[PDB]
Amino acid sequence: RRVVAHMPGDIIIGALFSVHHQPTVDKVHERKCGAVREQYGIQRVEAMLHTLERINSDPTLLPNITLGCEIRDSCWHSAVALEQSIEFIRDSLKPIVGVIGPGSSSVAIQVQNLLQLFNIPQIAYSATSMDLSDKTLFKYFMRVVPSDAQQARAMVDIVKRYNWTYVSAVHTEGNYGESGMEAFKDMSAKEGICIAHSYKIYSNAGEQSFDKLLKKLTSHLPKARVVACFCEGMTVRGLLMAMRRLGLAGEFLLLGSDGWADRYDVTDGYQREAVGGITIKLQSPDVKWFDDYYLKLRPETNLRNPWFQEFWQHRFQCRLEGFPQENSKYNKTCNSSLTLKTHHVQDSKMGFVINAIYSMAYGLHNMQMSLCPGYAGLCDAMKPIDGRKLLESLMKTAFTGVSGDTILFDENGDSPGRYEIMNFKEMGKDYFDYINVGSWDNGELKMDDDEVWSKKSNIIRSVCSEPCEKGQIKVIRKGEVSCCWTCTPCKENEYVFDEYTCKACQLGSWPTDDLTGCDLIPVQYLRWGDPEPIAAVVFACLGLLATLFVTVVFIIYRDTPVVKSSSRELCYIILAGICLGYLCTFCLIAKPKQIYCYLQRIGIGLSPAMSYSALVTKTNRIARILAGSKKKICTKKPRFMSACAQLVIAFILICIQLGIIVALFIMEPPDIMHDYPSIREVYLICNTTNLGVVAPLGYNGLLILACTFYAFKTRNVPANFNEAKYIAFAMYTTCIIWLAFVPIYFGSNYKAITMCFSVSLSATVLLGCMFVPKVYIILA
Amino acid sequence: RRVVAHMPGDIIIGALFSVHHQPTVDKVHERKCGAVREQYGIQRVEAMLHTLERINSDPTLLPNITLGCEIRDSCWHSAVALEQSIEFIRDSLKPIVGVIGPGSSSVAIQVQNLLQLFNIPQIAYSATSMDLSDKTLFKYFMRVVPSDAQQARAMVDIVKRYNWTYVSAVHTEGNYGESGMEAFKDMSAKEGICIAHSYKIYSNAGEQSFDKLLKKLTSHLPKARVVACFCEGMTVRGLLMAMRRLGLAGEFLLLGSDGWADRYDVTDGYQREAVGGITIKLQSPDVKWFDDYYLKLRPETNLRNPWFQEFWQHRFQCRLEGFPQENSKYNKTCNSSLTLKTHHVQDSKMGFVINAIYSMAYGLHNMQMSLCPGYAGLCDAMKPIDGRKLLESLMKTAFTGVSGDTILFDENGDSPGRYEIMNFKEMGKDYFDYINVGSWDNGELKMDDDEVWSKKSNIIRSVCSEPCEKGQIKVIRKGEVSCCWTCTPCKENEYVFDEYTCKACQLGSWPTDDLTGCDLIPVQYLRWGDPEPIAAVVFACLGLLATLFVTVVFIIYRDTPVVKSSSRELCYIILAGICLGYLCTFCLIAKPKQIYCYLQRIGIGLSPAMSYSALVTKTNRIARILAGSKKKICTKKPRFMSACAQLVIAFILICIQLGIIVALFIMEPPDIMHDYPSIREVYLICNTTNLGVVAPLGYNGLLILACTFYAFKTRNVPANFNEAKYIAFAMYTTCIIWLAFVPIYFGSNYKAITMCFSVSLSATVLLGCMFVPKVYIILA
Numbered sequence A, B: 001r002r003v004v005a006h007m008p009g010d011i012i013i014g015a016l017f018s019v020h021h022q023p024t025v026d027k028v029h030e031r032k033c034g035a036v037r038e039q040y041g042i043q044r045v046e047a048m049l050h051t052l053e054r055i056n057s058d059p060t061l062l063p064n065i066t067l068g069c070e071i072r073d074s075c076w077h078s079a080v081a082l083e084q085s086i087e088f089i090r091d092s093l094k095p096i097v098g099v100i101g102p103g104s105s106s107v108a109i110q111v112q113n114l115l116q117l118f119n120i121p122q123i124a125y126s127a128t129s130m131d132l133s134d135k136t137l138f139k140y141f142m143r144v145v146p147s148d149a150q151q152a153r154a155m156v157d158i159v160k161r162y163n164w165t166y167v168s169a170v171h172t173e174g175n176y177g178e179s180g181m182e183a184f185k186d187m188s189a190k191e192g193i194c195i196a197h198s199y200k201i202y203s204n205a206g207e208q209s210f211d212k213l214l215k216k217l218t219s220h221l222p223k224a225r226v227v228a229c230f231c232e233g234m235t236v237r238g239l240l241m242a243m244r245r246l247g248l249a250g251e252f253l254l255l256g257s258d259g260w261a262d263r264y265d266v267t268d269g270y271q272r273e274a275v276g277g278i279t280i281k282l283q284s285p286d287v288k289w290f291d292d293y294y295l296k297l298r299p300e301t302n303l304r305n306p307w308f309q310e311f312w313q314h315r316f317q318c319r320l321e322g323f324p325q326e327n328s329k330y331n332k333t334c335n336s337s338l339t340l341k342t343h344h345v346q347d348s349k350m351g352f353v354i355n356a357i358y359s360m361a362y363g364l365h366n367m368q369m370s371l372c373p374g375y376a377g378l379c380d381a382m383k384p385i386d387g388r389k390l391l392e393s394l395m396k397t398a399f400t401g402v403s404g405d406t407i408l409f410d411e412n413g414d415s416p417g418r419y420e421i422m423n424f425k426e427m428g429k430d431y432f433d434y435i436n437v438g439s440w441d442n443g444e445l446k447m448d449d450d451e452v453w454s455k456k457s458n459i460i461r462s463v464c465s466e467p468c469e470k471g472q473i474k475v476i477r478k479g480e481v482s483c484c485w486t487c488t489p490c491k492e493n494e495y496v497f498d499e500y501t502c503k504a505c506q507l508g509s510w511p512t513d514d515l516t517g518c519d520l521i522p523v524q525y526l527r528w529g530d531p532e533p534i535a536a537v538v539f540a541c542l543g544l545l546a547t548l549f550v551t552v553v554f555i556i557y558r559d560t561p562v563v564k565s566s567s568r569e570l571c572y573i574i575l576a577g578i579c580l581g582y583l584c585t586f587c588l589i590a591k592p593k594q595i596y597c598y599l600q601r602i603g604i605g606l607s608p609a610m611s612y613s614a615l616v617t618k619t620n621r622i623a624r625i626l627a628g629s630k631k632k633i634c635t636k637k638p639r640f641m642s643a644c645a646q647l648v649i650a651f652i653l654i655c656i657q658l659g660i661i662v663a664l665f666i667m668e669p670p671d672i673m674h675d676y677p678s679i680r681e682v683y684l685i686c687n688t689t690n691l692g693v694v695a696p697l698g699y700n701g702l703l704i705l706a707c708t709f710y711a712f713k714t715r716n717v718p719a720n721f722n723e724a725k726y727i728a729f730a731m732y733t734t735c736i737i738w739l740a741f742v743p744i745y746f747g748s749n750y751k752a753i754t755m756c757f758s759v760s761l762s763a764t765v766l767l768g769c770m771f772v773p774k775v776y777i778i779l780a
């Protein structure tokens, strides 16, 4: 059988403290537990044994009745604790009216499942998992500490404050670890946090298991540099030992939990691997009277604690010769100068144990007051202490704890509590310590980012991918966790609306500077100004000046003998054609509008006919004068009427041209098209079809052929300075110029400027080859 | 307080059967159980009570000693079962040497946690969770059924066989449901399957909880029509009741598990909502000798079963007034005419219970034979039966079960087993039943897809997205479950490398049909055929005919005064230049090849330059001999240069042209560029560049300018048939022929046909306007 601590009293209160370490992986079946514990063992045992004495001494609490205890060792194991609980309830098969629950959540659950069948309230001081908050399954369970829902919140707040996204999760196999990690995973995946992989491991696992776990952790080392540990102290210690073994000294950031807290026994010897790690600790002020009592304990006088001799020998490596527990393993003896003061560290969860004991005592006191207000002691209506009544009294009892605050239980049996954020840092040389760097209280996460990471240099944030949101590059997530993405540029034609997809502008638009919204690229027109249009306007102006000068000379030299052979009316039509051609370019080089491109077409059509048809009829006559004279045998042939015939021949040729232009205008009406050659640029012009520029042009070319043919007939006939010869050069040059612009026209969409220049050149060639004699011959 | 079945014996075997239903959500704390169960209760109790008597009667098994029992009710609850186990082990604090474990996995775990402390082996018949396979925590636990890993595999196989990807998961709160659903999730999400959402719910949850669960399930109804239920019978029944209540009668296909199997008590009354459900059932042949004992049981004679009278009154709604149990609740009495034969259904797992009891008996037999081979009975070395020895003997025992096969335990305490796939179908009008449609045995899923869905119009597949392998249209996953994707068509330019990306080919290439891969664009070279090149070569042939005709006429009249005006050798290299220019056409329009690639270049370089050189060297003399004649003061220097030096002064600068063209040539070898004008088409051309084409052209232009200047010097001069004027006009028109094609060349693609036309035009205009006149009347 196992040894237990005893204390006589009227009412007996059970206890389950992990005096010894958890059984090793190979000694589980034998249910033998390992070395003695100081913080979790002897300290808590002494704390209870002294708190009971304090309660007994106090008259204002539980008067006239003394409180006893039966403290048993759980060895931090479910199997051992269940055995001890069976020993507790053996009498029910002095009764145990209540127990101070074990530290572990899984162990607490196992013990509660047995205790609830006998109506024995259980108060825990460190059991934290959310699973114990279910009063349907755990009616007789209370704790003086909050659930680990708040702890998971605090951890999520920590990971979100430092912009850690691609973290890794490790938790101890059990109930505390499982519940904690589930809650953390939920609240982390909710906001924006992603887990590379979740790993689980027993505390008492071998070296090989921890090595494999750390290899798996390092499999994501370059990216996931922060590990979320909902792990016990032994799990963290095993991780540190693995880090030491395989040569990791600070490329992980361990985010601890309540299990780690500020325990010095999890980092002793392996400090350098755990430096920089952040842990969450339940806030509990150090108890002073407990220290005053504890630091004066000696093995010689302290008999009521059965494990104290073993602990004394284990702490100061020595053998106590005078007592049965010699443990001759240790070499040296224990001199009478060893004190517990040296290297004394009180456990963090010391206030909670005293608070739990006080809560049980106050519950009993309240129930005793409520049952028999008159009698001072154990009234007859209590001797069979009813578990249900005690539970009901405990669920509503309130008192002032050792810390100074008021302790009360909510509907779920929990108690209010706040957390302290501690960062493991190196103070000096070969001197590490836990430093308080923040707190968490009902949602607010106060922190001190100056103490943690002295320099802005903060542990490379656990990010699965660098921010791809810079410019045109777009985010594409693969068939993996939706926190890292491939960063790809989508073509500049497109713009990014969603971070994960981009679309292009329809036909005539472009993305803005920010690549959020098309900008409808500006339309380019012919634009008065620009070198080539200015040259066109200059040429048009000079041409118009020449035309008006020639017209002036003609309307001054009306009926001069020299100008009598040519048809005066027909020459008027010639000048009209030339002037209209010169006006056509002025109309054409401009902003396209309905009004402008209504009459640019009639210009380009009518002018080269209104001149060239009249030239045809003029040359025809001047040939008929000579061609008819070749025979000179007998010709009563006034077939063609001097001018009468010539003018109507004109007014029919020009009118058929006008008819064809009007038809081509009617069937194809002019609109202001916004033709899009490329996605880059947008132009606007009036709709021209192939027909609209090939039919009138073809007809004009036919007139060119007619004039040239007739000019070749007449060639070098003696005339007034041989004007027919001038017509010869006129038509030769006109045909050459017409043939010259074919490539540039049917090559570049430079339709407008080439058309303008062609019309101007054709006009100036006539205005030159003709009238040149008329300007200086008559000048003579 | 709770009743117990008894049977006297030397060795007592415990049992835990769920005789009554699970305590209701209100009465959990009072641990008062529900109504009686037939399949899971009385039938199993009677099975044990009869199989023990069969074993006792058998002389070849457990000889000379009797086997007793102590059957207790667990009410399918962990709290009640723990109390009953405490009652079991109270004697250890006649001992119970071992128990036949409870049906539920969680309940089995709770019972085992207590039993392993007292070395009491536990054999389960329906516990299936994987958690019980861990011998570290459950050393004294064995099962005659396989773990639920195989069950999860079977379910994954079922969902894989029917294209189901986007399913929803439900599991019962507990250990069986949790382990099953975790295993299923792992092996489903691993391979190809998707889960819309995983839901958990307690079996004894209220109507409201089931309503909320079904609302959440319907929230994904259009896409996820298959529900994977790793749920108990009561959970499935609750789901069916919810479906009936909110009028959901065929939307879902429930995929059951061992909990459902082919139980008629989970679908009775609510058949119409469960039709078309597929369930997995552990194969176990019906035990024939059990029926012949069970069907003859009557309440009057069966006194050894404490629950039999209550069950009799519950099954046939009647009050057995005669007996202590009357339960007035049932109005009518029962005549002595009701038999268990009517509506008799033996449960699926009757074979497993009998096999477990036989396993325990055979274990005891083997251990007895090993301990004392000589004595037949309870030898003195066996009075304190050791649990460890019994466990060791049980872990290696093998025997023949009721079915006929051999029952043995592996290292983990499990047993081999095969699964049977059952389908809930409507056979006839007002008739439903389970139909065996498949099996699963060590990864082999033999199904019959004809009995289920007797057509091709099966259940709408639980798929989130239709197969989007439609040509290009890639898949884009939107952060949620891979399963659900949008469809974007990817650009013609590019093709699909994988399902999730589309990349473009090289600078010159096209994706093949159905965008599968990539191909090479055929090179469409400038064919010897085609519309334009045939005209070009016709023109070249006519030009060459002109050259040979002119050369012939020159050879006919060599020393005639009408020809002997200038150096006849100059008007030999003129024709040489013309011929070479015409040959440039033939050496240009062809397949771009190494040889032709320099031939064309040397042609275009030398020929026009060398022709115009000789024209220059003729015209300077013909101008200067009369330029000096204009003044003629003395000018008695007939030589100057003149004489036959003309040929030398032409040839030196022709060699200069050859030198410069060789200079351009040495930089660029006659290779072929694969010019890419657009993404769609690929062309090939010679290695000519801007620098390699603009220098010889520029030099030739300089010669053109020089010759034009000299032609302007001469123009109209009286000589033999007036050569100068015609050649001057020829050069004038040539100057602008050289300029017409410039825009459509330097920046174009058809720069071969343009060259072909330009050289021919320049050749005809230079020949037809230089020699033609001289040879027009060459006859005279």
Ligand SMILES: C[C@@H](NC(=O)c1ccc(C#Cc2cccc(F)c2)cn1)C(C)(C)O
Residues within 6 Å of the ligand: A577, A578, A579, A580, A581, A582, A604, A607, A608, A611, A697, A737, A738, A739, A740, A741, A742, A745, A746, A754, A755, A758, A759, A760, A762, A763, A764, A766
């Ligand atoms: C560019 C194109 N040219 C023309 O489409 C065109 C149209 C009209 C004229 C003219 C004229 C003219 C002539 C004399 C007097 C006058 F007022 C006007 C020239 N070219 C082609 C034929 C390819 O060269």
Ligand SMILES: C[C@@H](NC(=O)c1ccc(C#Cc2cccc(F)c2)cn1)C(C)(C)O
Residues within 6 Å of the ligand: B577, B578, B579, B580, B581, B582, B604, B607, B608, B609, B611, B612, B697, B737, B738, B739, B740, B741, B742, B743, B745, B746, B754, B755, B758, B759, B762, B763, B766
């Ligand atoms: C098409 C192109 N023209 C030429 O690159 C080119 C090169 C050579 C000639 C010639 C010639 C010729 C002239 C007389 C006799 C003879 F044998 C050959 C014309 N154009 C550009 C510059 C755009 O005008």
Ligand SMILES: *[C@@H]1O[C@H](CO)[C@@H](O)[C@H](O)[C@H]1NC(C)=O
Residues within 6 Å of the ligand: A161, A162, A163
């Ligand atoms: C974390 O949050 C954002 C991430 O860019 C940034 O504004 C902030 O400075 C980061 N760092 C800290 C210490 O908050």
Ligand SMILES: *[C@@H]1O[C@H](CO)[C@@H](O)[C@H](O)[C@H]1NC(C)=O
Residues within 6 Å of the ligand: B161, B162, B163
């Ligand atoms: C989907 O099911 C069909 C038959 O129901 C069959 O082609 C195969 O099992 C599945 N399809 C594929 C592509 O595997």
Ligand SMILES: N[C@@H](Cn1oc(=O)[nH]c1=O)C(=O)O
Residues within 6 Å of the ligand: A103, A104, A105, A126, A127, A128, A129, A176, A231, A232, A233, A234, A258, A259, A260, A349
């Ligand atoms: N809340 C923790 C308590 N605790 O865990 C440890 O590892 N030490 C310790 O005190 C748990 O539920 O286990």
Ligand SMILES: N[C@@H](Cn1oc(=O)[nH]c1=O)C(=O)O
Residues within 6 Å of the ligand: B103, B104, B105, B106, B126, B127, B128, B129, B176, B231, B232, B233, B234, B258, B259, B260
């Ligand atoms: N397979 C279940 C057992 N079981 O659940 C039911 O609903 N019926 C039944 O036999 C388990 O492993 O706990």
